[PDB]
Amino acid sequence: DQICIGYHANNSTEQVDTIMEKNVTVTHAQDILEKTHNGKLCDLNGVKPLILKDCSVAGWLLGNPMCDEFIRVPEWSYIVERANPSNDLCYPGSLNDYEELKHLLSRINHFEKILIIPKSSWPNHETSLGVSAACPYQGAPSFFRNVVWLIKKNDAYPTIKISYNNTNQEDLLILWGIHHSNNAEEQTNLYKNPTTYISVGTSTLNQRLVPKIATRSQVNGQRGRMDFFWTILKPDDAIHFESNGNFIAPEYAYKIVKKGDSTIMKSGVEYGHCNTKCQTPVGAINSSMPFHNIHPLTIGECPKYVKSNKLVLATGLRNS
Amino acid sequence: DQICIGYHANNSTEQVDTIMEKNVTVTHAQDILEKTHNGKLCDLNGVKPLILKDCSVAGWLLGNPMCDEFIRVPEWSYIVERANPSNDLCYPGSLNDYEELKHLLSRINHFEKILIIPKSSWPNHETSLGVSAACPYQGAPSFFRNVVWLIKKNDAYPTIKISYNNTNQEDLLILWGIHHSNNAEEQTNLYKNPTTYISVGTSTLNQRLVPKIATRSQVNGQRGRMDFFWTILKPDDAIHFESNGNFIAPEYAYKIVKKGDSTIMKSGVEYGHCNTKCQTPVGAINSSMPFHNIHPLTIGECPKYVKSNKLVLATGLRNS
Amino acid sequence: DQICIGYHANNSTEQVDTIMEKNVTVTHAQDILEKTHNGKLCDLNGVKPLILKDCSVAGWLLGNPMCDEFIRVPEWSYIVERANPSNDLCYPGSLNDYEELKHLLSRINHFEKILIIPKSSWPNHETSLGVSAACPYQGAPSFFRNVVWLIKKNDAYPTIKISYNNTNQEDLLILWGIHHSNNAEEQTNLYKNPTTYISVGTSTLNQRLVPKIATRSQVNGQRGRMDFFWTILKPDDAIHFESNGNFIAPEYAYKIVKKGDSTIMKSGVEYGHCNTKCQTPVGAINSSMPFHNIHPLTIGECPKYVKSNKLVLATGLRNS
Amino acid sequence: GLFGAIAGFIEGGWQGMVDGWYGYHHSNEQGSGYAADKESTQKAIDGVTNKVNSIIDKMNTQFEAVGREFNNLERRIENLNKKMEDGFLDVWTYNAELLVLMENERTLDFHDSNVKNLYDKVRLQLRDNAKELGNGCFEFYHKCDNECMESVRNGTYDYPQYSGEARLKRE
Amino acid sequence: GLFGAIAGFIEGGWQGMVDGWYGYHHSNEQGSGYAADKESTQKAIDGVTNKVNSIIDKMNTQFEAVGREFNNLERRIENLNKKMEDGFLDVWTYNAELLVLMENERTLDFHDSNVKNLYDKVRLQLRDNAKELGNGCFEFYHKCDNECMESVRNGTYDYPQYSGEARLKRE
Amino acid sequence: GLFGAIAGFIEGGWQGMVDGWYGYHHSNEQGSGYAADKESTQKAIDGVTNKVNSIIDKMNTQFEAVGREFNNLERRIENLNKKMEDGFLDVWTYNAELLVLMENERTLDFHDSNVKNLYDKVRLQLRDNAKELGNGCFEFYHKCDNECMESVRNGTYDYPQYSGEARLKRE
Ligand SMILES: *[C@@H]1O[C@H](CO)[C@@H](O[C@@H]2O[C@H](CO)[C@@H](O[C@@H]3O[C@H](CO)[C@@H](O)[C@H](O[C@H]4O[C@H](CO)[C@@H](O)[C@H](O)[C@@H]4O[C@@H]4O[C@H](CO)[C@@H](O[C@@H]5O[C@H](CO)[C@H](O)[C@H](O[C@]6(C(=O)O)C[C@H](O)[C@@H](NC(C)=O)[C@H]([C@H](O)[C@H](O)CO)O6)[C@H]5O)[C@H](O)[C@H]4NC(C)=O)[C@@H]3O)[C@H](O)[C@H]2NC(C)=O)[C@H](O)[C@H]1NC(C)=O
Ligand SMILES: *[C@@H]1O[C@H](CO)[C@@H](O[C@@H]2O[C@H](CO)[C@@H](O[C@@H]3O[C@H](CO)[C@@H](O)[C@H](O[C@H]4O[C@H](CO)[C@@H](O)[C@H](O)[C@@H]4O[C@@H]4O[C@H](CO)[C@@H](O[C@@H]5O[C@H](CO)[C@H](O)[C@H](O[C@]6(C(=O)O)C[C@H](O)[C@@H](NC(C)=O)[C@H]([C@H](O)[C@H](O)CO)O6)[C@H]5O)[C@H](O)[C@H]4NC(C)=O)[C@@H]3O)[C@H](O)[C@H]2NC(C)=O)[C@H](O)[C@H]1NC(C)=O
Ligand SMILES: *[C@@H]1O[C@H](CO)[C@@H](O[C@@H]2O[C@H](CO)[C@@H](O[C@@H]3O[C@H](CO)[C@@H](O)[C@H](O[C@H]4O[C@H](CO)[C@@H](O)[C@H](O)[C@@H]4O[C@@H]4O[C@H](CO)[C@@H](O[C@@H]5O[C@H](CO)[C@H](O)[C@H](O[C@]6(C(=O)O)C[C@H](O)[C@@H](NC(C)=O)[C@H]([C@H](O)[C@H](O)CO)O6)[C@H]5O)[C@H](O)[C@H]4NC(C)=O)[C@@H]3O)[C@H](O)[C@H]2NC(C)=O)[C@H](O)[C@H]1NC(C)=O
Ligand SMILES: *[C@@H]1O[C@H](CO)[C@@H](O)[C@H](O)[C@H]1NC(C)=O
Ligand SMILES: *[C@@H]1O[C@H](CO)[C@@H](O)[C@H](O)[C@H]1NC(C)=O
Ligand SMILES: *[C@@H]1O[C@H](CO)[C@@H](O)[C@H](O)[C@H]1NC(C)=O
Ligand SMILES: *[C@@H]1O[C@H](CO)[C@@H](O)[C@H](O)[C@H]1NC(C)=O
Ligand SMILES: *[C@@H]1O[C@H](CO)[C@@H](O)[C@H](O)[C@H]1NC(C)=O
Ligand SMILES: *[C@@H]1O[C@H](CO)[C@@H](O)[C@H](O)[C@H]1NC(C)=O
Ligand SMILES: *[C@@H]1O[C@H](CO)[C@@H](O)[C@H](O)[C@H]1NC(C)=O
Ligand SMILES: *[C@@H]1O[C@H](CO)[C@@H](O)[C@H](O)[C@H]1NC(C)=O
Ligand SMILES: *[C@@H]1O[C@H](CO)[C@@H](O)[C@H](O)[C@H]1NC(C)=O
Ligand SMILES: *[C@@H]1O[C@H](CO)[C@@H](O)[C@H](O)[C@H]1NC(C)=O
Ligand SMILES: *[C@@H]1O[C@H](CO)[C@@H](O)[C@H](O)[C@H]1NC(C)=O
Ligand SMILES: *[C@@H]1O[C@H](CO)[C@@H](O)[C@H](O)[C@H]1NC(C)=O
């Protein structure tokens, strides 16, 4: 004939962290940290990502002969590439504002490649001979697909007067470049003009380029360099090209038809024919936990990243 | 014949937030968040702000013909301008280090405009004809007031040998520029020199400029461009100008007489003939609250900004 | 015949801070803030620091004639120099990417200076006459030790064809520069070439330089300028120099033999023949406290910096 | 609610008590009026005022949100600046919101503990001479004048004098 | 452990009580079975669920850790970006870890205070009619049916009826 | 002050008690000397040491304050770096100062709750055999040797043996 008071006790071994007492056993606890992932590249909201098979962003945009599976790409949710892609600027050189271009490409989900300047628009230059062995195809000298290396034709190189309306309703990404020779004889043997220039003029861009004919060291077997440049042409805006030589004329531009959100992700994981809301270079979080500790860089619906190995919130009473 | 214990209870409906119980009624509470403002531009410590009536910082400094109400300005507490000022570089072009100049101007409260180079110092050039329709005044060709567009006189353009002591005790802001032509005939028809240069030399500045004669697209009806440059001349330091053509010679400099703290604020609010300690692009905080949620950018004596819609600190007991 | 309960009480005057009650006396308290330092420069883990006696980083690397005690330096733990070193670029000019170079030097603990280009490799130029009074030694015209100012010899200046293998297993820091003349006569009187150039070519570097012959103001008695450039040559990588004039040819390079962690510290404190785990521009923390408030910039095993004048954690009960 | 006095133990606060925060419903044959404990309320007001003032004092030093201008080719640096701006505002908003939430517990617990403290203070002085009830009210075994009411308030209750009266009354 | 009920006062929880969190080991001649307080447990569950939900709600806005690319000549800016990345992750990790630590005290204190609260609630209703023991159990002076067990649970204990029985039994 | 034992309930600590933190002023015909509770003090010392060690452990990862150099034309980036430097130092200073303030309450509350806990532990064992007073001291109804003093300390008080003695003495 007596009443009594106590609390619920179970046989679980859940443990929580308290600043004054470690390793406290509780009856019920809620885990708020996610430490598991599928381990494979997985689709983002049902959209297949752009997976560069050992290829770089610049190589894909410039039309690397090896990276020819990206000639026509569908809409993508994010761009994923290896940390050190082997196929990247097969011809030695650099891409100006390459990091800025990658930042700009981080918010583009689709490109519609168009032939702004056809190969028939150069009747007085040579489109056929611009082939290198630093850019080989099926073991034959070849060169980047999306730009044209113009060579002197019939021992002449007339000045280029090329203009192009942006009659489209979307921004156009135009890629051109300049070739730096090695010596004076190479310059006259391939361009016929000792002193050349490249002037590009838009509403906001006023650029003039002069090749640097110097002596450098062999990169990919070539002591020559090619510096590439890019611009974003606004609708109803014209772009003008005037060149005396050393011109890598653009051939294909890119329409920015869809402009959402994305990331450029560095991971060597393989595709898994999957479907996830949040992606990770390590894997994919298939959970709705408050926190996770897989990787700081995460795209999609992603839980918060913390550097803690465990995070358990006590819910029940002490288990004793 | 009995004592009893209770607490104070009132009829108020003040509500506070507790992490384990929302919407808790308390007898007395203190609001620590400010959510109100006057909604008008208001003076900072009794100093009238510099309000640019649809004008930009660069247009004001270069002497935009339309922005002629800022020819002589008094001391200001901060600079306020519209997000997209229509009057900004009436002639197409750019101002080099424009963002850096705005950062430098954020800590200047007064300028004393002086005639460093009078119009009578060019007896062999043409100050009268440098007028454009991209910079019109009362519907007549005109040009920026603070700089001089020098044109060839008597079919000649002698080399400019101009030097200037900074005999003043304050730093001098000097604005000059270079004009980029369209074609070779325009260059010889207006400057008489095909190959021109602009060399500026100070204690810390060694600059050489060459115009880019290319083909661009019409901006404000002009396919030509003008790139402007600025420098801060230290006391007892001389500045030298050597130019063969395409020179937008400085005419008026700016003395940095008062150098305190200020901001460049983007707001379309109108002046209100007011007096406030802290300013906001949205309004002015007339309170001494611990926190506010009007706008992150705030000048003067300003409370802390938080992104919370409410912040109430419980003071009294629970109201029940 | 009665039991009773109380707590420990002592006679100490330790005081702690509570958000609802300041200045609370407690029986026992633990101080977690360090406010003391030795006040002298002190060795880091038994390694003597690199102390620049009123000399700059650029002056030390370029071989300032005054800063000749750093001709051969041992391994150092960190670099310490005055806030405004008097010996810094004795000849007026600038060092390109000087801030970037200092960041790179922040992770280098030892250099092995080597004679990459001996003075006997210039039989057709003049190594002897490149002496200035802006760089005096024992009151005699002199110039930077680690680079060579090349002057025309026998009224001639043949083009320089210099290449150098990096046969070593460590990165090589190469310092070169370009001299900007004052007028055309000075250029022909000292270099014999009116139009000169400097082209430097490596695997990753393609640079061309043209002197700016303008009129500037006297700095250290000289209206001429010298702009210096640096590069990091990778192992098995060659560097090429082609110059027609105005060339400050490199003479001594620097081997990056040890590459750890360090800082560049600005302090005017003197050496103390000491030994500390963590260093500070103000002094050295000889304690293992959780926190300190000496200086935010700290090298070695350093406690956390906070801007609080006191930090005491209560351990015992209230002293009353 | 941790100390369980203001919320659940006593049903509710007194609406007619307008002075101070903690009071005594002294009921006597002379008169049934309210009262207030100046000493307990003042230290409660002092603690609350110290808490809010110290909260403001430690919050005067936060990020100033300085605006900067970047051109079209500095989008990486602009995004670098933009994220810091938002990141510092996010943590400070989290700090301000969480501090209010936690201090709201402490303030209510402080108020909850105080009424429990004044509950215990009267009980420990009165001991067996008063019959403790389910509410915060104490039914005295012995009738006493307003002198005993203020003696309880002053903390100088005379126990031995009234101890005999309660013992004689109790059977 | 602050309120000293769950940890030290009562030796341990009941293993056979699977409903709710706080219960009553009602021992009677009719039967010695367990029970649970629905009202006390529900508000305890509501408070815990509100705490974790509000913790998640205030943690949805943190730093996104956006990656950026820098070239070889922008190491200062890259290190400038890298330290912000780590600095924001460090404070958010500190905020998340510390919040769990502090809320773990509050949750255990809330559970500790609740059992103390249910301890006091039964004691204040029962008063002298029940003999209080060293454990959380109350030994009734008067025997009563399961009606009194549920009356204590419901909070509507009839004191005057059983007060006379306890007084007569006590000597 | 939340639990109201160390500050207001008992007037002050004992100056002559130098061993441990919590003790017993055992007064007896054999001798009136001090004492200390090893078990209660050790867990109090263990908790305090765990608190400070864990505070240091979670504070080893903060911002390093790396210095960088910027030229005259990079004032925007320099100010961008300068504000992050100050912003991270401000939040970490706020985190360190606030953590000390909050943990100072918990440490004092932990000490306040412990004396209240040892207050209740002795009271629940002694029950009616001891007369509870306004201070923390318990006046025993029955005289007992130092065996009873240490029995209370050990937590193994023999109630039934001394229950009859107290009942006979009480009238
Ligand atoms: C510092 O350290 C380095 C090592 O790290 C040392 O380097 C060493 O230097 C010595 C010097 O003697 C070498 O010795 C060698 O010994 C071996 C064995 O006997 C020889 O095989 C070596 O032969 C090389 O030099 C010989 C000198 O007599 C030459 O006779 C020989 O020909 C060879 O030089 C190279 O020859 C090949 C032949 O195919 C050339 O290939 C073609 O040349 C063209 C003109 O330059 C083009 O470059 C062409 O490329 C194409 C392309 O891209 O595909 C063709 C295409 O049609 C073009 N496209 C268009 C549109 O026109 C493009 C286009 O022109 C360009 O892209 C424009 O930019 O070009 C190319 O296939 C090579 O070019 C030519 N060499 C060059 C680059 O000029 C040699 O006798 C050591 O072996 C060597 N060790 C190394 C390198 O590891 C230094 O010595 C060290 N310094 C010191 C001081 O010791
Ligand atoms: C791509 O897309 C675009 C559209 O987005 C298309 O553009 C289209 O191009 C076609 C081409 O035929 C146009 O067709 C037109 O049809 C209409 C209707 O018939 C005509 O009106 C058009 O006339 C234009 O071209 C005619 C060709 O025959 C010309 O005869 C005609 O004159 C006109 O050209 C312009 O003429 C005006 C006359 O006033 C010129 O004004 C003056 O010229 C001066 C020399 O250039 C100066 O520029 C002067 O400016 C001043 C100043 O600033 O005020 C004067 C001042 O005194 C000077 N200051 C000093 C100190 O000396 C300054 C100074 O010199 C400069 O500042 C230095 O920099 O200058 C100026 O007032 C114009 O200049 C001249 N045009 C230019 C810029 O050269 C034409 O027949 C379509 O209408 C057109 N559609 C558009 C534009 O939307 C492209 O075709 C598309 N591409 C393709 C492949 O399809
Ligand atoms: C604005 O404000 C400023 C003040 O802030 C004013 O400046 C003032 O200008 C007036 C103009 O009249 C000055 O008046 C002076 O009055 C006093 C008293 O009478 C005179 O002493 C002054 O004499 C100067 O000008 C005279 C004009 O007649 C000259 O006759 C006189 O010679 C002197 O000019 C200077 O002369 C010295 C003599 O030693 C020159 O020294 C040598 O010159 C060489 C060629 O330029 C080299 O520069 C050489 O340097 C070396 C080196 O570095 O050591 C030598 C070395 O061998 C070389 N190395 C190699 C490898 O070859 C290097 C190398 O060539 C270089 O490094 C390459 O870059 O060079 C050097 O020792 C001086 O050069 C020469 N002056 C120069 C720089 O050209 C004068 O009559 C006021 O005194 C003056 N006030 C001041 C300055 O505070 C302006 O007037 C104001 N503006 C206005 C409008 O008012
Ligand atoms: C699980 O709990 C039951 C009581 O509910 C207990 O008898 C059993 O031993 C527990 N299991 C383990 C493995 O301890
Ligand atoms: C808690 O348990 C884990 C694993 O069971 C162990 O690694 C850790 O050291 C324990 N913490 C203590 C004993 O403080
Ligand atoms: C995981 O993915 C599946 C389908 O891909 C989805 O139904 C589920 O909600 C996701 N989350 C968990 C925790 O399973
Ligand atoms: C205001 O408080 C009084 C008691 O002080 C109460 O009678 C009245 O109803 C309250 N007012 C309202 C609107 O509830
Ligand atoms: C608190 O009240 C506000 C407005 O009265 C309401 O919007 C909100 O949903 C309430 N919070 C609850 C019910 O948790
Ligand atoms: C508002 O401004 C007035 C005068 O402009 C000043 O007296 C007052 O203190 C300010 N603050 C408030 C809260 O009224
Ligand atoms: C130190 O403590 C003793 C008691 O332990 C006390 O008598 C003495 O007065 C104290 N010293 C001071 C300076 O108060
Ligand atoms: C605490 O004491 C210090 C020095 O003893 C004094 O400066 C400060 O004002 C005091 N704090 C108060 C009285 O709140
Ligand atoms: C200070 O330095 C000495 C030797 O340099 C070392 O033994 C000691 O541990 C250091 N720390 C303290 C607190 O003395
Ligand atoms: C007792 O209480 C009365 C309040 O009526 C006050 O005036 C008086 O000072 C108090 N006396 C003491 C000794 O506290
Ligand atoms: C009393 O408790 C019983 C539980 O058996 C419940 O069904 C009933 O509704 C309660 N009555 C009241 C008035 O709370
Ligand atoms: C009782 O207390 C004494 C202290 O004098 C101790 O030595 C002994 O071990 C304790 N016994 C038990 C059973 O705790």
Automatic annotation (TrEMBL), chains A, B, C:
GO biological process: one example: virion attachment to host cell
Topology in membrane: Single-pass type I membrane protein
PTM per Swiss-Prot/TrEMBL: In natural infection, inactive HA is matured into HA1 and HA2 outside the cell by one or more trypsin-like, arginine-specific endoprotease secreted by the bronchial epithelial cells. One identified protease that may be involved in this process is secreted in lungs by club cells.
Molecular function terms from GO: host cell surface receptor binding
Keywords, sorted A to Z: Clathrin- and caveolin-independent endocytosis of virus by host, Clathrin-mediated endocytosis of virus by host, Coiled coil, Disulfide bond, Fusion of virus membrane with host endosomal membrane, Fusion of virus membrane with host membrane, Glycoprotein, Hemagglutinin, Host cell membrane, Host membrane, Host-virus interaction, Lipoprotein, Membrane, Palmitate, Signal, Transmembrane, Transmembrane helix, Viral attachment to host cell, Viral envelope protein, Viral penetration into host cytoplasm, Virion, Virus endocytosis by host, Virus entry into host cell
Disulfide bond entries: C42-C274, C55-C67, C90-C135, C278-C302
Predominant subcellular localization, coarse grouping: host cell
Known partners and oligomeric status: Homotrimer of disulfide-linked HA1-HA2.
Function per UniProt: Binds to sialic acid-containing receptors on the cell surface, bringing about the attachment of the virus particle to the cell. This attachment induces virion internalization either through clathrin-dependent endocytosis or through clathrin- and caveolin-independent pathway. Plays a major role in the determination of host range restriction and virulence. Class I viral fusion protein. Responsible for penetration of the virus into the cell cytoplasm by mediating the fusion of the membrane of the endocytosed virus particle with the endosomal membrane. Binds to sialic acid-containing receptors on the cell surface, bringing about the attachment of the virus particle to the cell. This attachment induces virion internalization of about two third of the virus particles through clathrin-dependent endocytosis and about one third through a clathrin- and caveolin-independent pathway. Plays a major role in the determination of host range restriction and virulence. Class I viral fusion protein.
Name of the featured protein: Hemagglutinin
Organism: Influenza A virus
Lineage of the organism: Viruses, Riboviria, Orthornavirae, Negarnaviricota, Polyploviricotina
Gene: HA
Residues of the full protein shown: 17 to 336 of 567
TrEMBL record, chains D, E, F:
Cellular localization per UniProt: Host apical cell membrane; Virion membrane
GO molecular function: host cell surface receptor binding
GO cellular component: host cell plasma membrane; viral envelope; virion membrane
Keyword ATP-binding: no
Keyword Cell inner membrane in record: no
Coiled coil: 56-90
Record keywords: Clathrin- and caveolin-independent endocytosis of virus by host, Clathrin-mediated endocytosis of virus by host, Coiled coil, Disulfide bond, Fusion of virus membrane with host endosomal membrane, Fusion of virus membrane with host membrane, Glycoprotein, Hemagglutinin, Host cell membrane, Host membrane, Host-virus interaction, Lipoprotein, Membrane, Palmitate, Transmembrane, Transmembrane helix, Viral attachment to host cell, Viral envelope protein, Viral penetration into host cytoplasm, Virion, Virus endocytosis by host, Virus entry into host cell
Primary location group: host cell
Gene Ontology process terms (BP): clathrin-dependent endocytosis of virus by host cell; fusion of virus membrane with host endosome membrane; fusion of virus membrane with host plasma membrane; virion attachment to host cell
Subunit composition and interactions: Homotrimer of disulfide-linked HA1-HA2.
Function: Binds to sialic acid-containing receptors on the cell surface, bringing about the attachment of the virus particle to the cell. This attachment induces virion internalization of about two third of the virus particles through clathrin-dependent endocytosis and about one third through a clathrin- and caveolin-independent pathway. Plays a major role in the determination of host range restriction and virulence. Class I viral fusion protein.
Family: Belongs to the influenza viruses hemagglutinin family.
Protein name: Hemagglutinin
Gene: HA
Full protein stretch here: 330 to 500 of 551
